[PDB]
Amino acid sequence: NIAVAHTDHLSVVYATMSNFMLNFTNNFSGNHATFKPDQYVITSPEGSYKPIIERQGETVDGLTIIDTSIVWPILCQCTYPLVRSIMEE
Amino acid sequence: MLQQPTGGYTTLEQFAFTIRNDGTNATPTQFLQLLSYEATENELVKKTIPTPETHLPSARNVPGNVYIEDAITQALFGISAQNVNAHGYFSRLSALALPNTSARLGLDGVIYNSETINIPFYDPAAVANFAATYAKLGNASTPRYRADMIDIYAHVGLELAGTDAERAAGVMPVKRAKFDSWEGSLISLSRDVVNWKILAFLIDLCSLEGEALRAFKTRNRDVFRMMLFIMSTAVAANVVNRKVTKRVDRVLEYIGVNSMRTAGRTATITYDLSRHEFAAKFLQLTFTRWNA
Amino acid sequence: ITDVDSTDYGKLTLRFLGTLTRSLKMQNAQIRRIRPDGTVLRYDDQIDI
Amino acid sequence: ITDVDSTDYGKLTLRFLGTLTRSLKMQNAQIRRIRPDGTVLRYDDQIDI
Amino acid sequence: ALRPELAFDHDHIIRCLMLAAANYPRLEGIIVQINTGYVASANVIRPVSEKRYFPENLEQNQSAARLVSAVKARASEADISSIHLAIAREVSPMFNVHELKKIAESFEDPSSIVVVLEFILFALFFPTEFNRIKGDIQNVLLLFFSRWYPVEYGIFVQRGATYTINAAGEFEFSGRNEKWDQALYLSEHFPALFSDVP
Amino acid sequence: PALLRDFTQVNWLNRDITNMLQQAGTKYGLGLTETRLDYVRLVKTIVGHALNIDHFAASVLNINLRALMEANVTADDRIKALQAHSMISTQFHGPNQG
Amino acid sequence: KVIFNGLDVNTEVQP
Amino acid sequence: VFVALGIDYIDIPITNSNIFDDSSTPYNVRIWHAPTMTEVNHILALMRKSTLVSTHSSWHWNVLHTFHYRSESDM
Amino acid sequence: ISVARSMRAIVNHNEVDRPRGAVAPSSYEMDTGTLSRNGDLLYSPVANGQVGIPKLEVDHISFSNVVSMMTANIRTGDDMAVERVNPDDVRAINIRNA
C-alpha cells in the first residue's frame, strides 16, 4: 500500500535534497561491501590535527544515536499524499 | 629528525641507561656485578622460541599522539600499571610500520600522526624496522597470539644468571639471585628503569645489521639484562632479605621461573594477568630479535 | 566586535561528559585526506578536490 | 583522633556487629588454613588464595 | 543578465565548511534543520492516529501474545519531528559517527524475527544511515544467526567476523570473531556480514 | 627563595641565590610544565604544574594520581559490578565515557 | 513506545 | 559448538563405569575452546593458578580437557 | 640546635660584604627538577647525559616540585548513568555451562 508513496514521491524529494547547497558529502555509494567515507583533517606542521569526522559518542545535539524503530510508524501509522477522496494536491 | 649513528642511537650520550646506586649514577653492568647466585636442584632448559606471528594489528583511527614509550615501560616495570591490554594503544606502533608514513616516533616516545616542528624524532626507516616487529605487542592479548608466559622465562634466566658455559650449553641450574642492598632497592631499580628511553635500545636492536649490530649486542647486553632483572623480580615467587653482620642482602628466588603470582607486595613491582601476557609477548619478540 | 555567535565553537558538547574545550590554534592548517590508520596523506590532485 | 566516615547503612552494620575487636592479637597476624585436626598449615601456593 | 554582486566562491565556501566541521559542533545540526524543514514543507509524510500493525483479529488471538507484545516492544508512536529527522539524516552530512540505539534482543522466540525485519526495512528506507550503523546491527545479527543457524554461524565466524579490502580490491577476512565498535567505522575494517562473498 | 632573585634588597643573598640559579645543576621553575591530552577527545587531561610545595607532599600526591591514572579502569568497568548484582543475562548500555 | 535517539538511561551506578 | 555458544569451555560430567552405582562423581572433565597450541598454553598457565585441577599429557579429539576434582582425596 | 634553619640574617652589613654567620638557602630548595616517567620526583641533572637524582633518595628538602593534577576535563568519583535491560523471559536464561 505504502510503496507508491515512497518510490513515486519521497524518492523525488531525496533527489532534490541531494542537490541542496550544504549537503556537501558523498554519504554512501550503494555498495555496503566496499564504501567507506572519505576522511579529512585540518592539520598543521605546528602540531594541530582536527578530524572532520570524529567518533565522540552521544552528543547534546540529539543527532548521533539512531533508533531504527522509527521504521515502524512509517510502515504502519503514516498517511502519505499519494496513498490517501484520494485526490490531494 | 635524529640521524642514527654508525652504532645505535644508544651510542649517543643523550640515551645513556644508568640506574641509581650508592649515591651515583651506576651503569647497569656495574650493578649486575653486585649480583650473586645460589644454585638449586632444578634445571632450566631453554626450548626454541616460537616464531612471532606475521600479523601486525591494525592501528585504529586515533586522532591523538599516543605516548607509546611510557606505556611499554609501565607495562614492563610500572609500580601501579594494570589492564595494559584494555586500551590497546600498543597497536599504534603499527602506524609507523608503513613505508613513507607521515607518522613519527619522537624521542619523547610519542607517536605523532604528523611530522611537527621542534619535536626531534627517529629516522623513519629504522622506526619502520622497529615497528615491523614491536607492533605485534598490540596482539599480546588476542587469544590466537598470546606468548607462553612460562617457557620464555627460562631464556630470561640464561641471559641474566647464565655463565658463558651454561649459556653456550643452553641449560643452567635454577638460581636464587642476591645482592647486598639498600632499603626499597627493587622499587628504586624499577623506577630508575621506567625512566629509561628504551625505544632507543629497541630501534637499534631492530635497525642495525651486520658487525655493527653485533657490537651492539655486547655493548648493551647489560642493559637488556637489567630490564630482564626487573621482570624476573616481577615474577619471582618471593623476595626475602637476609641479615648478615649489619649488612642486608636482598635475595630473589627464583630467577628464570615465572610463578604467575599476581598479588601485590611492597618488595617489587607486580604483574596483573594482562602484564603477564604483555611481558611474555615482549620477551618473545625481543629475544627473537636478540638471537640471530 | 564583529557581532557573531561563537558559542560552542571549538568545543565538544557530549551528553555525558559536558562541554570540552579544544585548542583553537592551528597556524598554516590544511585540509588533507587521512589514512584509516589516522596518519595524514599527501594531497593528491587525483582524488582530493 | 580519626573518626572514620561511613554511610548511614554503614553505621547500621557497625552498630549491628557491633562492639569489641580487642580480644585478638594482631602482632604478625596472618590468614592461614588450619587442618581439621587443628594444626595451622603453612601457606600453600596451589591451594590458599 | 548581469547581477551586480560577487560570484559564489565554491572553493572558499567548501574550505570554511570543512573548518566549521572540524570546529563547530552545531554545524551538523544546522544543516539537518534545513533538510528537515524541507521535508516538512514537502508535506510528504504525516502521522495518523490509526496504527495498522496487526491483521484482524490476530491481535485478539491468544497464541499471538508473545508475538504481539514483541511487535509492541518495537513500534514507536509516530512523531513528525522524528520521522522527518529520519528522512533528512539520509542526505545530511555526518560529522560525528552515528551509533545504533542498542537492542537487547536474545532471539529465543520466533517473534524475535521482528527485530531482524526492523533492520531490513531500515536498510531499505534508509540505506545510507544503515550503512553508517551496519556493524552495530551486525552485533545483533550475530546473536540471531548463532541461535537460528549455529552451524552456518560457526563456519561464517570461523572465516572471520570482519574484513579489510586491499589494493587490487580483494577482501581479507580477519579469521577472528570479535565485537565491532563504531570506533571501527573510521578504520579500514568492515563488518563481514555485508561482504556479500559466498 | 628562588623568587627573591633580583627583588630582595639584601645584596649577599641576591648574589648567592643568583649563583645557585646560574649553576648548571639547578633550575627553578613555576607553573605549567607538562600536559597530557586524550587520545580520542583531544582535550588536555593530566597536566604537571611546578608548585611551591615540599617534595614529600608532592611525592605522595603524585603517588595518588599515578595509581588512579595507571590503573586503566574507567567508570564503564562499574557495569561489571552491576552485572554481578543483577539477574544473569541482564544488559547494560552506554555511555562509553572512556 | 515513543522514539528516542539518545541512550535511554534509567539507572545510576555509584563509584 | 564453542563458536556456536560463545562459551570458553563446557564442564562435562564423567560416567561411572559400573552403571549400578549412583555415587556422586569424584571429578568432572572441563573441555576448553583452545584451537591452537598458544591457547592451550594460556589455559594451562591460568589453570596453574586455581584449586584442584589436573590434566593429561595429551588429549583425545585433539581438544584440551582438564579434570576438576571435588576434593583432594579424589585427586 | 637550629637544624631546621634554612636562612639566617637577611640584612646587609654596611661595612663587610656579607654579615658574619649569614646563611644562604640550599640550592636543592630551588631545583624543581622534573617529574620522572615513573611519577617519582627528580632534581635537575648535574651534567648532560646524566639523569637527575631522585628527590626522595637524599636528605635535603626541596620546596619547588612538579605535581601532576587533573584538569576539569577529567572528573572522578561521579555517579554515572546506564540503561539496564532485563532478560525477556526468565525461562530463556541459561546458567551453565558458561
Automatic annotation (TrEMBL), chain B:
It comes from the Viruses. This is Viral structural protein 5.
UniProtKB/TrEMBL annotation, chain H:
This is Structural protein VP3. It comes from Bombyx mori cytoplasmic polyhedrosis virus. Signal peptide: none annotated. The chain holds residues 153 to 227 of 1058 of the full protein. It comes from the Viruses. Coiled coil: none annotated.
